[PDB]
């Protein structure tokens, strides 16, 4: 899926956040579920932005079915939910399938 990194475990989740802190590059995470309509509708844009901003922003995907513990720790309630992580901690979020809002989120934290 474009440049998006599929997170398959808590261990991979921690390592990616640790690398993003090392490299001083922001991380945008898409918390998804295959039963969620809005999640499937904005996934193509998340993939496109992952290609456009490759080198500036790290893009992760967390399926709440595959890694329930990471979704629980993140406090997810609705989907799609986007989280921005800087230096290991959550710095921003965006809930909903708004296309303009997602483009603005990635642009805000890539500058």
Residue numbers in the entry: 1 to 111
Sentences reproduced from the published study:
In the present study, we deepen the structural features of CrTRXh1, providing the 3D structures of both the reduced form and variants in which catalytic cysteines were mutated. While the subsequent catalytic steps underlying TRX-dependent protein deglutathionylation and denitrosylation are yet undefined, the reduction of protein disulfides implies the formation of a mixed-disulfide bond between the CysN and a Cys on target protein. Following the formation of the TRX-target complex, the C-terminal active site Cys (CysC) of TRX performs a second nucleophilic attack on the TRX-target mixed-disulfide, yielding a reduced target and oxidized TRX. Whereas the role of the conserved Lys residue is still unclear, the Asp residue was suggested to be involved in the deprotonation of active site CysC in both E. coli TRX and Chlamydomonas reinhardtii (CrTRXh1).
Indeed, they reduce disulfide bonds on numerous proteins involved in several processes, including antioxidant defense mechanisms, photosynthetic carbon metabolism, and protein folding. In addition, TRXs have been suggested to control two additional Cys-based post-translational modifications, namely S-glutathionylation and S-nitrosylation, by catalyzing the reduction of glutathione-mixed disulfides (–SSGs) and S-nitrosothiols (–SNOs), respectively. The redox activity of TRXs relies on the presence of two Cys residues in the conserved Trp-Cys-(Gly/Pro)-Pro-Cys (WC(G/P)PC) active site motif.
